[PDB]
Write a protein that binds this ligand. Sequence first.
Ligand code: HEM
Ligand code: HEM
Ligand code: HEM
Ligand code: HEM
Ligand code: 2JX
Ligand code: 2JX
Ligand code: 2JX
Ligand code: 2JX
Ligand code: 2JX
Ligand code: 2JX
Ligand code: 2JX
Ligand code: 2JX
Lengths: 141, 141, 144, 144
Amino acid sequence: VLSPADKTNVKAAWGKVGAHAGEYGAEALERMFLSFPTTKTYFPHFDLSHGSAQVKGHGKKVADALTNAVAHVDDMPNALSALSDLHAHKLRVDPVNFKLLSHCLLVTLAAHLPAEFTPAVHASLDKFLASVSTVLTSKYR
Amino acid sequence: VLSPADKTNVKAAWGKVGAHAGEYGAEALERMFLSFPTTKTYFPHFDLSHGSAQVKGHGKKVADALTNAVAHVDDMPNALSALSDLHAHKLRVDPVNFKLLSHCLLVTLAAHLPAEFTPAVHASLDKFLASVSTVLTSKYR
Amino acid sequence: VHLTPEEKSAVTALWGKVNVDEVGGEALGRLLVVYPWTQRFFESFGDLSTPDAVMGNPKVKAHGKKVLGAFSDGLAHLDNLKGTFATLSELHCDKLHVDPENFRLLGNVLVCVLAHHFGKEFTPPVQAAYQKVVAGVANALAHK
Amino acid sequence: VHLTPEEKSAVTALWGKVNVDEVGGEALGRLLVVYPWTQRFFESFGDLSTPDAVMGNPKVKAHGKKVLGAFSDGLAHLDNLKGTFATLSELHCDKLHVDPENFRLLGNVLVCVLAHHFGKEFTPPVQAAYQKVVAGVANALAHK
Ligand code: HEM
Ligand code: HEM
Ligand code: HEM
Ligand code: HEM
Ligand SMILES: */[SH]=c1/[nH]nc([C@@H]2COc3ccccc3O2)[nH]1
Ligand SMILES: */[SH]=c1/[nH]nc([C@@H]2COc3ccccc3O2)[nH]1
Ligand SMILES: */[SH]=c1\[nH]nc([C@@H]2COc3ccccc3O2)[nH]1
Ligand SMILES: */[SH]=c1\[nH]nc([C@@H]2COc3ccccc3O2)[nH]1
Ligand SMILES: S=c1[nH]nc([C@@H]2COc3ccccc3O2)[nH]1
Ligand SMILES: S=c1[nH]nc([C@@H]2COc3ccccc3O2)[nH]1
Ligand SMILES: S=c1[nH]nc([C@@H]2COc3ccccc3O2)[nH]1
Ligand SMILES: S=c1[nH]nc([C@@H]2COc3ccccc3O2)[nH]1
């Protein structure tokens, strides 16, 4: 459950991504909207076409949330508190959608970090994202 | 996330069940084995026919685990620590199976607690079981 | 979906005893209450702010009957569930965009409703037959 | 599964570039490593105690080729995935008793492998087409 080895792996991926995090965040959202159209119903007011500034701005918010999570990895429930309320109580986001976005976030990194996306790093990022998602859906439990 | 209202509801259901908990635990296992045959592959050495003493004895162990969880509900991760290691690391139990057993545990209670299984209690037991299951699969994250 | 004769008996004997005017609304209401994200699709139904509000909501019960009507129709055509749920599939998938996971949740909540109503009579084998039925139905709705 | 002409192009152009001797084993290995409960089904494959052991295991790669062979065959008969995976379905479902959720995990790990290999070339629309393909395949294997 986010062992030292996983933290080391997620911190290494984070480093390589660097300043591209927001752009990759935007890309993952696009990947999700295109691959899983049901998720589009949560963003009725967003324009989801390619190059959309709304998706670019949101990608940055998602990336920023994910970085704040790894930055306080030993206390993600507290750090992700306000976002859990938002996603479960207000937006009523279906738990399955967290899996879909997580899959798209991983796919995006895989497509940008040839060297870093080893089987071990992939397992660590997968567990990192499953933890974030479990925190974001904790308000349903 | 296991609010005071849910605790009150789960404690009320626990009370009504009373001394029948182990028998109901045995019944839920049978319900799971019959409804979801894939789960049977984890108990190759058990005889799963009706009246099986092995299923009866295991039902009691499952019920006892669930009672220890509600008894230390504010610290389930610690209380369910050794069982998480067992289920994820040793038995390699597929996460989806926790959902299946949880569904069977709820069905069993529904079939025995006509008065207690109100929509509200059902929501509370569902969240209680999802918490237990999330703890039992935490070793995968 | 192919049920053995004993699974069809198990299912059919119980179904004939179902109060078609109440169970459907009880299943839908419990779904909205247990899995609150499903309420996102019923903004028009009104007050769904508490279990009692949801359960006692005229629209929830009125709508549940249609749902139960759908299962009944399915039960009759367990061999052509694809053909039977064709239009319902287009509606939920293409128009509403409901994630298919939720068809499985509703099927299981139904199963809990049946257990609540019938008690000891909803035996493990009777449940096993019904699980096969809701899986088949969830699968048919999901084809689109 | 019905892909529009542009989705078939997206899929086919990439597939012809796949190293059929490596990607299959990479997908299977990553599945065993990322979702360790899947290893329960490969007790005979040997040392699967570390990522490197798994990835460099002769049996994992040898077996992955068969898996990739299955997807390729599926790609060719996207209209009859049910008929195509008939026997594989009986095997995984009736004999092995693998929960269908895992067919979806493997399909998605494949998608990650393809993204890793092709990079910028595995665009969002190209991924969307492949998601439709693995869903269809997972569904066909699950029919039993
Ligand atoms: C990795 C998990 C996720 C992270 C880290 C994430 C993060 C965020 C952040 C930081 C915000 C903005 C909060 C604010 O501006 O105050 C947000 C809003 C939102 N998220 Fe997520 N989110 C996640 C998953 C999802 C998923 C799975 C869905 C639904 C498919 C979703 C739907 C929404 C919606 C609709 C908004 C509000 C958009 C608006 O109205 O402006 N999120 N998310
Ligand atoms: C509500 C969640 C669950 C609870 C509370 C629970 C509890 C337990 C307990 C208390 C034990 C005995 C530990 C011991 O004797 O030292 C056990 C063992 C075991 N459980 Fe679970 N369990 C859960 C879910 C599952 C599921 C979902 C599966 C697989 C479908 C499973 C498969 C096993 C197996 C195979 C054993 C060992 C049996 C043996 O070899 O004797 N458990 N469980
Ligand atoms: C698996 C069981 C399901 C069955 C058998 C079922 C059946 C039905 C039927 C018969 C209708 C009415 C169609 C008509 O008026 O012509 C309907 C409508 C509807 N269902 Fe379902 N349903 C199921 C699951 C779901 C789920 C889980 C959701 C989402 C949480 C959903 C959301 C709706 C909505 C919003 C409508 C209203 C459509 C409208 O009037 O515009 N359904 N359903
Ligand atoms: C969705 C993708 C899947 C496809 C396309 C696939 C395809 C195949 C094929 C072609 C075979 C060999 C059949 C033969 O030797 O005649 C096979 C065997 C096997 N697969 Fe899969 N498979 C998939 C998923 C899974 C998953 C997720 C598991 C479980 C974790 C699994 C476990 C096995 C096992 C243990 C065998 C060996 C059977 C034996 O030799 O006794 N498969 N698979
Ligand atoms: S008694 C009750 N109420 N809900 C359930 C759920 C529904 O969602 C599921 C998805 C997959 C497997 C099992 C369930 O049970 N049981
Ligand atoms: S990059 C990667 N690795 N695994 C995944 C998973 C597989 O399991 C799933 C089930 C349902 C929806 C999405 C996924 O993505 N992505
Ligand atoms: S209601 C239903 N049935 N299938 C689906 C969606 C449609 O789009 C998909 C894209 C990628 C994977 C799986 C899908 O199933 N909704
Ligand atoms: S591999 C596959 N496909 N379907 C299934 C199982 C079989 O038994 C079930 C019982 C109850 C619900 C769903 C089922 O699908 N394995
Ligand atoms: S079952 C099971 N165990 N872990 C998972 C999730 C769900 O789908 C995912 C999506 C992205 C990353 C990891 C994922 O694994 N599903
Ligand atoms: S409650 C409930 N049901 N499913 C969840 C989350 C959602 O996303 C996940 C993503 C990865 C692993 C587990 C996950 O469980 N929370
Ligand atoms: S998606 C989603 N959100 N919560 C759930 C689980 C899984 O299936 C269950 C099985 C038993 C009780 C509650 C359950 O809800 N699945
Ligand atoms: S990791 C991973 N993937 N899925 C889980 C658990 C398993 O059982 C659950 C049961 C109810 C809600 C969420 C659950 O997530 N843990």
